[PDB]
Ligand binder design. Structure first.
Ligand SMILES: [Zn+2]
Ligand SMILES: [Zn+2]
Length: 83
């Protein structure tokens, strides 16, 4: 019944207005930038816990755009709609 507790290191990358959080893809996921297998040589990549965009640690500097699963002020927008 009893249990313990301990801190947890959590680092987020505010790149291209994203939340890419360091994650280990035990399986060859389908990247969004290059769209590679994302597996092989012992290494990890990146995955946005907001829009769920899995990319390579290097593809992060290639990304061309912004995040969608983010709530920020709306100064100008063609046709916004949320609730
Ligand atoms: Zn990639
Ligand atoms: Zn995102």
């Amino acid at each position: 019944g009893s249990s313990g507790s301990s801190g947890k290191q959590a680092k987020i990358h505010y790149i291209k207005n994203h939340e890419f959080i360091a994650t280990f893809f035990g399986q060859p996921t389908f990247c969004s930038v290059c769209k590679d297998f994302v597996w092989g040589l012992n290494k990890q990549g990146y995955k946005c816990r907001q829009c769920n965009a899995a990319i390579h640690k290097k593809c992060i500097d290639k990304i061309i755009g912004r995040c969608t699963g983010t709530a920020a002020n709306s100064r100008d927008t063609s046709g916004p709609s949320s609730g």
